[PDB]
Symmetry: D2
Subunit: 295 residues, 4 copies
Amino acid sequence: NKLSGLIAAPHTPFAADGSVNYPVIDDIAKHLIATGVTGAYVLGTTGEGIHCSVEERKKVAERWVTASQGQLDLIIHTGALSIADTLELARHAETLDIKATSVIGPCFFKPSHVDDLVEYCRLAAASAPSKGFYYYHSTMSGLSIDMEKFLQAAGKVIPNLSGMKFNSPDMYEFQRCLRVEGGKYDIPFGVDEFIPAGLACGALSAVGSTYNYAAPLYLELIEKFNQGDHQGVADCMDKVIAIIRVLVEYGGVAAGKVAMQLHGIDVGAPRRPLRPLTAEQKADALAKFKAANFL
Amino acid sequence: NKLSGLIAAPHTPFAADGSVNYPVIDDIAKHLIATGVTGAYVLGTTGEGIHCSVEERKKVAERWVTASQGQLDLIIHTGALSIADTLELARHAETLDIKATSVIGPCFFKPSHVDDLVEYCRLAAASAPSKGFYYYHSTMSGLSIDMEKFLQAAGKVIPNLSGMKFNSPDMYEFQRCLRVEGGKYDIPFGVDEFIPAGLACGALSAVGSTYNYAAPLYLELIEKFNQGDHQGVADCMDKVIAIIRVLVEYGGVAAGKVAMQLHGIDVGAPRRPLRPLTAEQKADALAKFKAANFL
Amino acid sequence: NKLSGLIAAPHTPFAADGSVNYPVIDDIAKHLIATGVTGAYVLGTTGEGIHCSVEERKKVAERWVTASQGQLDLIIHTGALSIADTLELARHAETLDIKATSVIGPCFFKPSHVDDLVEYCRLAAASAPSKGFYYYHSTMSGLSIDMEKFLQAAGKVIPNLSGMKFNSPDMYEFQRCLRVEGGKYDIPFGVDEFIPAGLACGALSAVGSTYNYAAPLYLELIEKFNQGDHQGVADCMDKVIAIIRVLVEYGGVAAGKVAMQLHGIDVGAPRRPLRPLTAEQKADALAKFKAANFL
Amino acid sequence: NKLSGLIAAPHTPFAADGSVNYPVIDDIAKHLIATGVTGAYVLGTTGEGIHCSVEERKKVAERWVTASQGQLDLIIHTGALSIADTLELARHAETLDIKATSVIGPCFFKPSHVDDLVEYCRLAAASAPSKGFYYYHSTMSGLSIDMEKFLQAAGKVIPNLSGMKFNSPDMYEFQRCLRVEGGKYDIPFGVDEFIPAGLACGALSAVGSTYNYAAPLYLELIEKFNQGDHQGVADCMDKVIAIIRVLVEYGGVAAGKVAMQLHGIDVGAPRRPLRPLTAEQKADALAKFKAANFL
């Protein structure tokens, strides 16, 4: 069963001292359900998964299950630089009522051959075997492996392979991945500000940080696209562009976290090494988000 | 005013000894006109302009004017690493019945500030003042200058600025450039294998190498896209993808030059430093182009 | 007290099933002491620190203390993508009889401003305050921050700053770092195959993987350098080059681990995602190490 | 046979309007001879060769022959993006009383295989067959070809191959190149700010821009290095570092051109696309050069 619609990549909320603020996960989940989002990609980049300890990540995933009350497709990102940590997280995720697990490409010792990336993913997927498995392809990992070649090789050895979260501007590679094995795999599209391109290139779902706080804007864009209203799509993209400008100026995680206050949710600052916003910067970011006129 | 439809970036034909084979330009131009292409972007990357001497480039541009008989919008790429060469080529282009001149970003001493790239373009545009002027933005130049900021700054000091040929996968930047100065500028889209993305993001024209030999395929794709026939676009992209695979395997210039034989035109090998294809490779490339089923 | 001489960056030994083989740490330590190495940089890149869990890393550091019996300067790399993990590791290292802790630059969310990298390091250093602190500068982290600027800023806020392990070919930057604050800081040089350059540019110590199994070769090179025997330095570098060729062919961690069998120590395979060597590759690597003629 | 000592890479002097100011070449050459420089690498990066037209480059090379009166080893850089230009420049250089020609790696269509770079060089060397031939390896070209493999392959098909100008921080690669074919080839070292590293790694000569105006400083550094006076080398490098800081702040070509005024020589501004210095910046750069205390 492939994903559909908008899947948020939610933040992990931190208290003033940087500890995980677990009850605020309930707030985020309720907001996602209310705004038409169909799922959550948990503890990925936007969720600062790699900023949390193994024990924090287990507790965050458990809280997402209880908070979502079966109303969201849940995908748990279990990736970490340590295979010990990854497999421990995968074994825990296997005990949860979730749709799938996922790992991003290791970004320090960078796999440079298809087979090496496949074997890393095979281990993670085999530790959560009764759940689906998505590779998380991100340009932030800096890998040079072609994702069509990866998907073809991984499909032969990972029996619970579901597909790939695609965080890359390479729309040619995206289209080739959609065609692997006769279209078998699920390739949720990961670049929010490319959404007209994703739709035109065959995306069935999109996973992204801005759907945490601007999902109705994108649901309107999708409807205008389906209705052939090209001017309406452009008008929606005026507002999408205005959002992205704030993320570029102030940092995607930091500014996106501030944006949650436009829905009454204080998810705290990012964790170091990410830089927090000053009070002046937070007020400027909120003002620019409001001027974007999407709420 | 603005370009429309498909603009081919034609090859420069070389004889067996590597000299320019000027009469074959007549053949290419007749083919472009016959297949519905509306213009030619001359002596760019596909045309190996930087592989030709100043005197060769002057004669090539003259031959395109004569060969096209007023039936193609002609844009002459005048860019070179030497400003002396660039301005000599621009002064010559100013004497020709052409639509516009254009320069690519200098790729050795790479401009790193907006104003530095603007001043280089300003000199080139001012030597062909009565023609339009397109900046050629290519990721091959390796510059880190944002194209929206460039276009805003360039518009203030280049009075014949027409816009920008956009050879980059950054669809967010593309959409911002389309919006500069209330949509004043012309931003032809340069990434053939992204054409559904470009169209969905507002492209009014496309400029590319594959329109030299597969224009009917892309004309059909554009028709299906304008009709909202999403499956039709994907079916066309099956064939586009098959073409691109051959260019990736054998080299874009080298394989595209071979593809011209499918229309009876021998444009020779690329010039060194580009590598020529062996007889066996040429035959394999032609077989793969035929199997792509676009003719 | 600045480091002196050769500091090995030891491997972490794994058993056949990938678990940590703690008693083999005793073997490595005894070999380092016997071959004239003065210290160990523990759980860095060569030690696959980021491949181990927090609990594994604590136990590995404890074993290095007991194994070394006060005969080695010990520097514990505590860096991890999670600040929670890093500070937990630093708090544990503070309880150990070691010289210093160290963190590498975070490589996913890459700090792009000096102050942001400084604050990350300040937190790690302040959790092991009674030990020295070395920043681990590695080109593998992909950061664009100038290390002289970093050291000048970090010196103002990190009171236990000792200096920097310098794993970069930028010998100009290296020389500037040696001069910060009148030469206050310790800059162990991290590129083994550059050692003549490091010596000529003022290095007082070198930290590296090849000193695990080839320390006498480099001790001879250093003596020849000090004695003005330029031909002897070149002759030693013939053998250094032969070693590096094997690391390039088969992987630095994987081939270096195999090299430990030339001293009777089986440190196992690298952990995934690093690729293990086949039996045929291991035999070829050992044969090439022996042909290098350094043992 | 092989170069020795310091080889300056001289500037090309431009008049106020950007035209070549040929008589100032006489001034530069007289200064180089007076200060003990043994050769000139002409129309390379520092000489802005790729900023000059073919006819300008011919006349510049002719002026260097006349101005130097047989007292400098002359190497003419003939490289250009167009093979037509390169071979025309090489044919002209073959008529001159010079030591060698040279080409830099093409930087737009980047050769990615050894044999492709070899064939480009082979053509350029074969058009000036009675002169030596140096490949110019520069990281500015952005090629990923290993220079030892290149030199081994090039030696088999280029009979007048002399060696390689080495502008890269990879001292391991440098040392391997020095060893090719039993040490046959000449590998002048191109990174001024690394000169202690180059000397320690076997350099017999250095080619660089700062030897245009600080040759006595580097002659003293070489003397101290050959004496094994490690503190003396470091004291000289204090002044080298101070020079390099000005080039980093204001641009290597732009600031180095200004530095020629410290010897009474006005070589003008760089050519566009390089940015000129304002009057205030020129005065600040000259003050910083004077404070470096090398004159």
